[PDB]
């Protein structure tokens, strides 16, 4: 517990440095802001263009020509500006659809990761998933996935079953492992050897069915207790 607390404390404190190390960490939000800002700037800049007309300024259009002839120039300018506005609106609609998809993904991530455990792999950051913490962002949400990743692995010789008086034995929850001289039962995701028989083994069939099997003593602590009554 103390080691887990120390690791968690030393891990969260590293998030600030990682985020503040480079300005490229927050790219997914700066890009979202910048695309809209630059699209709006381009739409504003499109206003001061001739679009094939004599002039881009309305006042000059009215002053230079009479209304019967300036009507054509006004129509040209209006059609061009309407086309520019329409293309801006279409771009904004597509970007809004993309942002809606991203927001639905963020809502799903919140409702799954933040409010409970999630067994979906890689959906909660690299490795196995523990509780998660969200953080507010200017134009989005930033998560913190507290993951559990194993490390410092060592290999043992295994076998699916253990022979005992012509009776196959299988692990109730775990995998048989051996350090070269003795066999033990351990949880699959953490090395923690134990004795075999007491509770973590169940019997099915005989030894001739499975392919690769090994013999070992299956010692129930029940029997020594019985010998105490002798």
């Amino acid at each position: 517990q103390k080691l887990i607390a120390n690791q968690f404390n030393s891990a969260i404190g590293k998030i600030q440095d990682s985020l503040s190390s480079t300005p490229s960490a927050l790219g997914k939000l700066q890009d979202v802001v910048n695309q809209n800002a630059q699209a709006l700037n381009t739409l504003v800049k499109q206003l001061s263009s001739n679009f094939g007309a004599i002039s881009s300024v309305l006042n000059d259009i009215l002053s230079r020509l009479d209304p019967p002839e300036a009507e054509v120039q006004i129509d040209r300018l209006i059609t061009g500006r309407l086309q520019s506005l329409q293309t801006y609106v279409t771009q904004q609609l597509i970007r809004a659809a993309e942002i809606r998809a991203s927001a639905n993904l963020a809502a799903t991530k919140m409702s799954e990761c933040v409010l409970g455990q999630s067994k979906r792999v890689d959906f909660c950051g690299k490795g196995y998933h523990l509780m998660s913490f969200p953080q507010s962002a200017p134009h989005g949400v930033v998560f913190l996935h507290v993951t559990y990743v194993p490390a410092q692995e060592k290999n043992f010789t295994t076998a699916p079953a253990i022979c005992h008086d012509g009776k196959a034995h299988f692990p109730r929850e775990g995998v048989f492992v051996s350090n070269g001289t003795h066999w033990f039962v351990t949880q699959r995701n953490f090395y923690e050897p134990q004795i075999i028989t007491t509770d973590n083994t169940f019997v099915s069939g005989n030894c001739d069915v499975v392919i690769g099997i090994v013999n070992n003593t299956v010692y129930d602590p029940l029997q020594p207790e019985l010998d105490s009554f002798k």
């Binding site: 887990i4 690791q7 968690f8 891990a11 969260i12 590293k14 998030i15 990682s18 985020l19 960490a25 991530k109 950051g125 690299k126 490795g127 523990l130 930033v142 998560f143 913190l144 996935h145 507290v146 993951t147 559990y148 990743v149 194993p150 490390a151 410092q152 692995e153 060592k154 290999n155 043992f156 010789t157 295994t158 076998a159 995998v175 492992v177 351990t186 699959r188 995701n189 953490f190 090395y191 690769g212």
Partner: protein, 79 residues
Amino acid sequence: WRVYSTGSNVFQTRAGCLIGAEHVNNSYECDIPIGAGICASYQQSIIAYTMSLGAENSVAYSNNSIAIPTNFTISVTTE
């Protein structure tokens, strides 16, 4: 503008020609996308090479060999 038109350092790729970038046959990660599995990076000069995919890790395997961790580490991954 045409000062960068020396043919002595022209490297030909599968996605256009390259000027002024040294070509090396070694393998590294993806630094600057170019195209057709070619990436350029900084060594003094600029090196353009062929893309590589991590480091080879041949996991030893056998019909009776298993590996289980004996320790853990907790990590926080931002998103």
